[PDB]
Symmetry: C2
Subunit: 111 residues, 2 copies
């Protein structure tokens, strides 16, 4: 369940930007940029390393939802899409979630 | 097009990791981590903000391939996946590309 499950279950409140039969995009509570949100699959996939080849269209779906919400958020100057795998990736929640950061200049390297 | 085009075209060398009929994975020339390689679409989508809703499985396919290469490359302790959009996003080349970074701990915020 994590907090993700409870949020999707609307058990607990989130700054929901978007929703459809496949995902939930809500604002990241500990933003690392002016605008920071997460686009996550309602379906549980702990980490990208274990995403199946049939999981393919959902991953790209998270990606498209991300690009739509970001434009919705007026992110016309740009943004950075992120997914963190495991320990070195700094994966906090073991449920696949796509980070979207904007509102400012991102730097190289990406952490 | 871009250098990514000529790379796809075999015009200029590249440290190729995997190829199939729709995409190419190869090492980043200026790596930002022990393992830093990219996954790019043969179809020239200039950037994610423009990607057709038809590019959804393709954009998912990138991520799929990516995590596969990360696994073939032995990245079993995690890594980070990145998609830079526009100036704020710090998009170096205007042709959709997915970063995969590992070999070391990735920090938060992600740039």
């Amino acid at each position: 369940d994590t907090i993700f499950g409870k949020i999707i279950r609307k058990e607990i409140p989130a700054k929901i930007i978007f929703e459809d039969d496949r995902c939930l995009a809500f604002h990241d509570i500990s933003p690392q940029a002016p605008t920071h949100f997460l686009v996550i699959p309602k379906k549980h996939i702990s980490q990208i390393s274990v995403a199946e080849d049939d999981d393919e269209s959902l991953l790209g779906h998270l990606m498209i939802v991300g690009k739509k919400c970001a434009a919705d958020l007026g992110l016309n100057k740009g943004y950075r899409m992120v997914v963190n795998e495991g320990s070195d990736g700094g994966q906090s929640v073991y449920h696949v979630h796509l980070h979207v950061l904007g509102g400012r200049q991102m730097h190289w390297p990406p952490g």
